[PDB]
Amino acid sequence: KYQVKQVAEISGVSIRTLHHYDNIELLNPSALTDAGYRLYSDADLERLQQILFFKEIGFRLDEIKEMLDHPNFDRKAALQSQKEILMKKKQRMDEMIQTIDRTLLS
């Protein structure tokens, strides 16, 4: 029911980006207009939403492609897994910063 331009509007996601999704089979248009323009369902938006969220959380376009279709996917698990990844990525920054403060004492 929604043309590419409508969703890019609704979501705030770029057309260019949205195209890229279609291209990597990450998010594909459900229908097609009679002139050949791509059409999107609400279930389609329902997916764009998952995408934007995993993306917000820290996932790369590719690992998101996986998660989405996989059967009995474990959300709680993934999120709890990510939270740990982030916690390590953070502590690592903290170390780098410390190292800089130590050096910056001369």
Place this chain on the structure above:
Amino acid sequence: KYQVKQVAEISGVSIRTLHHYDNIELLNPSALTDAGYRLYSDADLERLQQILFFKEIGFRLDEIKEMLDHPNFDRKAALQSQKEILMKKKQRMDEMIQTIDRTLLS
């Protein structure tokens, strides 16, 4: 005075890695043996050291290539700049984590 294999030993940096450095003009051997083997000075190690440090701090091989040769380079500035970059990279993680905790309440 030091052959590739010696430094890879002294530094703990891989030969493969060290080679890559020579290849991107990041760190180049001073001399050459009579058979054509690459030789490194101490000033050369003196550089490998700067490299390993900027690398530890968070710099990519390329931005390090710059810093090294540039004339009146401002260390204090760079480090203070990096510390900020890191501080933002950190706060960003923190947000992502928060977002996950919020979601993980259902």
